[PDB]
Amino acid sequence: GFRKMAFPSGKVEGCMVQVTCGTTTLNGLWLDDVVYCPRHVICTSEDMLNPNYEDLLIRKSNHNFLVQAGNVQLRVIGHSMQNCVLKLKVDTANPKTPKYKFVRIQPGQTFSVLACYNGSPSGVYQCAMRPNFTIKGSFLNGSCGSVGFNIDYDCVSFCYMHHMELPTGVHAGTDLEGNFYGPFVDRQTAQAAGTDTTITVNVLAWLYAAVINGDRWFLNRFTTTLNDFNLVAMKYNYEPLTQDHVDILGPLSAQTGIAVLDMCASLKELLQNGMNGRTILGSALLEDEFTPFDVVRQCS
Amino acid sequence: GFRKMAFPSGKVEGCMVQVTCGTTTLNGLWLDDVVYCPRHVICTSEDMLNPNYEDLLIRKSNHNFLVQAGNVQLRVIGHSMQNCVLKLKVDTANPKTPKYKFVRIQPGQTFSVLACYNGSPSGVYQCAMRPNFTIKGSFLNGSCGSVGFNIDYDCVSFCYMHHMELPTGVHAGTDLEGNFYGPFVDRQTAQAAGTDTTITVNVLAWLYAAVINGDRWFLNRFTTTLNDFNLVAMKYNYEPLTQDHVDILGPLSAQTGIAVLDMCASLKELLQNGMNGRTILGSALLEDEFTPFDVVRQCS
């Protein structure tokens, strides 16, 4: 097994609060004197079918928002919307605010989620942004407004806020400026995701992890061109590999002595032949939710 | 996919420190005015081959231990050993000490590890104590003294401290009173683990998780007796299921409407027939490192 490792969550735990509007409670993020949360908190069950968020927000007063940090009520002094994120101004700057920035991540990148229930931290796990801008896998039952982040040197980079579940069970959300990842809207109407694809560069990073962890059976004596690899990739719904992706795998290639295009030849054979009942890192399936950075972080 | 979720790590992050003795640096745990760490910190490479820990410890002065919390040196005022754990008394009580207890967990139970490098928190993941008292899977390269824990209501229950790697790549460690889990010793000599077994009650919890997450193909119209199930289990290196284990699965059985012995009949068929190229929760292998409590924590 190659373990998913989340970032330590302490810096984000001190920012989680509960936001209630009417009968709806979800998670908010308290940074300086602003609480961020999904704007759908202001919607009734009926409102969600076709909301006019500007009109709904105008009809709300500050006293219609109950913000609780532990057992402590924060007074709201201002409410506004930035795209799909509600910003509640409160009268107290969070004394536990970390150094932070707001970033918008790329498809295929990973991040940690602090899964919260009604403002209370419950668990932490590592998630990948799928190429179709959904988040796949199992989630904490009832967890709206939970946030995704990376820790850079001292700095928390917030990249994601959970808004929506698609009937398939996958999650959709926004960056912390309230822009959805992918084609989704915060309305209860028919929404399809695009076809998903396998994140090739992550599969290669995970094969490097396998090698570093002594799982080598799939290495073959062959090489390929980027062009010949990509013809096979396309047939198996893999993303095309670019020179920039090859360059990202440089450190794992140096650590293992296996040229990227040699690992590409190994992956081509695995796609064409299958595993013949064998496992890699205890899996019968190739894994694509570890980035090259995730592997180097854990393995170097 | 059914996600491994770790406990939020913030309460433990504030306790991690670096301990150095000569050229050896590893992790320590700073609770009130005591730093806990593996006693093998006092050993040279040569000492590890056959250490007399009492003699080695007598030859150490307080000034031979360098304890750093961030960039901050703590003065050691006392050194003693409890079984395989070194206790450094320091002149400052940790102001970030959480409510805590020390527990000794059972084989098959899970816990979160805050993986640290030279006192610095790096990542958090969920681990299971194998029936042979090893910890399996991939680990942070260089991480000695990292601790395992559960969070109970407000209270951190520390259960594990990493000491050793076995040549197979698995980890061995102690409880926080310095007693090894399993037959292992903190000496560089030939040590075998017992044969490992599959944690049956955890496989059943994970099949309940599958059902709750809409993966139902393996459910069959059959039941079994505990006795007839156990005859099959024994052949596939599964732990025998006891009435006490059946009772632990009550809540998942109630949530799904599937009797425990009906899920046992489903598992008997999976062991005898295999998966025929199908997956459960995105896995081709049955997973045994989620406890019934882990599933209820995430799914209820």
UniProtKB/Swiss-Prot annotation, chains A, B:
According to UniProt, the name of this protein is 3C-like proteinase nsp5
The known regulators of its activity are described as: Inhibited by pyridone-containing alpha-ketoamides compounds 13a and 13b. In turn, alpha-ketoamide 13b (tert-butyl (1-((S)-1-(((S)-4-(benzylamino)-3,4-dioxo-1-((S)-2-oxopyrrolidin-3-yl)butan-2-yl)amino)-3-cyclopropyl-1-oxopropan-2-yl)-2-oxo-1,2-dihydropyridin-3-yl)carbamate) inhibits SARS-CoV-2 replication in human lung cells. Inhibited ex vivo by michael acceptor inhibitor N3. Inhibited ex vivo by compound 11a and 11b.
**Record cross-link Glycyl lysine isopeptide (Lys-Gly) (interchain with G-Cter in ubiquitin), residues:** 4, 89
Residue ranges in the Cytoplasmic topological domain are 1-300
- Occurrences of domain Peptidase C30 (ranges): 1-300
Active-site residues?
Answer: 40, 144
Its assembly, as annotated, is:
3CL-PRO exists as monomer and homodimer. Only the homodimer shows catalytic activity. Interacts with host FBXO22; this interaction promotes the proteasomal degradation of nsp5.
Q: Which residues of the full protein are shown?
A: 3265 to 3564 of 7096
